[PDB]
């Protein structure tokens, strides 16, 4: 289930291509002698969208580490229960 719920969320980060839309703003910011009403405005949503990219990539980690740490609890709930060394007395008595 962690294998199935983490494959699609990674591809949401790869082909997001919102930095390419920033590159569309990059030809619209410096390359024209552009209106400062819109030069401030183009950088405004750019500052949102990079933070939206940070909130994208951090909401991966919450969904990511919400399963990895959820798995590390489960290994330690298995790796502690010794059952062989608690029975080697009980085997050899019956084996005798």
């Amino acid at each position: 289930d962690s294998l199935a719920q983490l494959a699609p969320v990674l591809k949401q980060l790869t082909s997001d291509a919102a930095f390419q839309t920033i590159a569309q703003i990059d030809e619209a910011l410096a390359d024209p002698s552009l209106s400062k009403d819109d030069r401030e405005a183009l950088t405004l949503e750019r500052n949102n969208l990079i933070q939206n990219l940070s909130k994208h990539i951090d909401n991966v980690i919450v969904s990511f580490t919400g399963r990895t740490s959820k798995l590390t609890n489960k290994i330690s709930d298995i790796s502690d229960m010794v059952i062989a060394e608690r029975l080697q007395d009980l085997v050899t008595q019956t084996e005798s």
Binding site: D1, A4, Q5, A7, P8, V9, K11, Q12, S15, D16, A17, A18, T21, Q24, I25, A28, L34, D38, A41, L42, L44, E45, N48, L49, N52, H56
Partner: protein
Amino acid sequence: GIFTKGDLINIKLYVKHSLELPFTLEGVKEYIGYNDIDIDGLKPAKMATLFKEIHDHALSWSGVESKVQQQSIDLENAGKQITLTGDEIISVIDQMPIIERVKNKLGDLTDKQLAEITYTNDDKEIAVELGNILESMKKDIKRQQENTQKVKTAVSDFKLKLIGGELSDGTIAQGLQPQISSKKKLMDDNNLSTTIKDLQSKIDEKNKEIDQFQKDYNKYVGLAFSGMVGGIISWAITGGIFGDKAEKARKQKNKLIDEVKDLQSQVKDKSALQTSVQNLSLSFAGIHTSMVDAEEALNHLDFMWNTMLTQITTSRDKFDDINDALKLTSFVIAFKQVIEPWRDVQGSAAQLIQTFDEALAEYKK
């Protein structure tokens, strides 16, 4: 696709052969062909419990497969009508320039059928405006997830009743595959090839006594007829001595022949028992072989629904960010993120339905 047409046959093979199995206490008792094994695990009260679990496990699949089929059709129909609407929206916003894009917001364009883009819901009604399509699609994606979770539950309930583990309710179900392998291991570990040799040791032991007591009764009666040649008085003497011991050895001859007749009757039933178990081992052997193929098939089935239930869920939760306060560049990358799982769910149902109906007509062969 992952869930091949041979996978769906292997399940329906398992469903077919399981319904052949009886589920009454009498019909299982006939099917196993015995009465009351000396060992515990093969007693028919356990067995009729076990087949009744299988017979109930088989009848669930008619509900399950119908839920798989009817949902995956809807996953294609929603998988296209959303994808038709969504690809048109991302195309027509790129007609707007990037300079004018930021000055506009989402609420600026919730007023009309934007560039004749429409949408049809699950309810076969049409929606034209962007402020109405995005709200209708929000209901529909929410509607498809809760249908899909009802599907994946019934799939995983069908799998984990077979292989074992926690069901959806929380009941740990013992796995049907090891429950067959538990009994099949019990049918190999049996003393039936030993006790029959042990009982035929005792019968051939007790026959040696009976073959000896016949010599005794043919001797004491020979001794008991000593008297009346001249000894009419001695007739009661040796007849008192030996005629008792002739009678006592004959009563031993009465008792032991009746015991050997009873001990032979145990060998007759246990010889019929050892045949009955060894035949029954082959019956479970196919049932175990059917479950191993049903094991692998459901695992690929569960993983595709788990892939689809993920992609519907991560589509819906990202789509909840959509509101009129979004500026128009930030709307697109958000909305483009919504539809990219719907490409694969469209592709997964296409990989499913093509690999579904082709196994149906093939199952008639």
